[PDB]
């Protein structure tokens, strides 16, 4: 499971939690890392095979990949905390979950957030096993042991939704919004490398219907893009890689090879700004964590970092 993998080796070595940046508190803080070192030891308890996977990534993990995930994670965070600060009421919809925690400190600390995630079957019945069995996740959503939740959620408990979802099924998709979330209140749409996933007419449906059906809202996007500049092979080796090592393919990542023809995709939204996360580095990034991350490891190699952040970009649309 690459992102986290990424994640928790990110941890591992103390990129994060970036306290500051992700707004958390000495006791959130604290919970962060255990949160996330409990999802690792849960998922052992459930799969000898992904959590091998994770112990390796995590033991070859190198400092370009894990700023590139502090990048990553900061650059939402920051995103999404501008606008829960400002819209108390607020209710955030994750496609494509994954591993993510982040609705652990959130739902903390935003009482009148709802967070909905999402994701394919298999996917969020992993994510339920090990957030029921561990008992510090357990405790911070107040689950239950035993899969308590009726279809279509997975857990439905306070303001916390799970819910599997085929993603590439608008209508699907719909009908799931239309039961955990109200036109009325502000959304926020998570789509952390989703789309990059999606056929386009998948993805464009998608970012039409969802954008849609809230009154106003904000998407923060990310994703990789191929590259605009003369000859540049990113897209193509990152495309012939995840044909062989995952065979997954990134239909449209040549088609959005740049972070405008990316953002024009929300072009629907009166308000869209898209950075490349090298451009986050450099303007976001305070220079005490600039400091602080130099502490950690040996980034001997910054135009590394600097070619595979000019890749990926955060893409934040609202309305």
Same mark, same amino acid.
């Given at each position: 499971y690459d992102a986290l993998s990424c994640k928790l080796a990110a941890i591992s070595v103390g990129y994060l939690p970036s306290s500051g940046l992700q707004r958390l508190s000495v006791d959130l803080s604290k919970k962060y890392t255990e949160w996330h070192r409990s999802y690792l030891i849960t998922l052992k308890k459930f799969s000898r095979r992904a959590f091998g996977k994770v112990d390796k990534a995590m033991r070859s993990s190198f400092p370009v990949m894990n700023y590139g995930t502090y990048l990553r994670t900061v650059g939402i965070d920051a995103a999404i905390l501008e606008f829960l600060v400002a819209n108390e009421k607020v209710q955030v919809v994750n496609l494509?979950?994954?591993? !993510?925690? $982040?609705?652990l400190p959130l739902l903390q600390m935003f009482p009148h957030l709802a967070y909905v995630d999402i994701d394919y079957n298999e996917s969020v019945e992993l994510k339920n096993s090990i957030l029921r069995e561990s008992e510090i996740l357990r405790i911070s959503l107040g689950?239950?042991?035993? !899969?308590?939740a009726k279809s279509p959620f997975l857990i439905d408990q306070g303001r916390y939704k799970l819910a599997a979802c085929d993603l590439n099924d608008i209508t699907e998709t719909t009908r799931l919004l239309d039961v955990c979330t109200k036109r009325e209140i502000p959304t926020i749409v998570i789509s952390e490398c989703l789309l990059?996933?999606?056929?386009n007419n998948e993805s464009q449906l998608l970012i039409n219907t969802i954008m849609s059906k809230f009154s106003h809202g904000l998407w923060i996007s990310y994703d990789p893009i191929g590259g605009s500049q003369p000859n540049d092979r990113f897209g193509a080796i990152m495309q012939s890689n995840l044909k062989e090592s $995952?065979?997954?393919?990134?239909?449209?990542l040549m088609t959005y090879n740049s972070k405008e023809k990316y953002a024009s $995709?929300?072009?629907?939204?009166p308000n869209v700004i898209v950075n490349d996360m090298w451009e986050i580095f450099n303007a976001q990034i305070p220079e005490s964590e600039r400091k602080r991350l130099r502490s950690?490891?040996?980034? !001997?190699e910054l135009e590394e970092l600097k070619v595979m952040q000019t890749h990926y970009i955060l893409m934040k649309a609202q309305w």
């Open positions: 494509g979950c994954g591993s !993510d925690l $982040r609705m689950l239950s042991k035993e !899969d308590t990059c996933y999606m056929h $995952r065979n997954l393919e990134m239909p449209t $995709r929300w072009s629907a939204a950690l490891q040996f980034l !001997d």
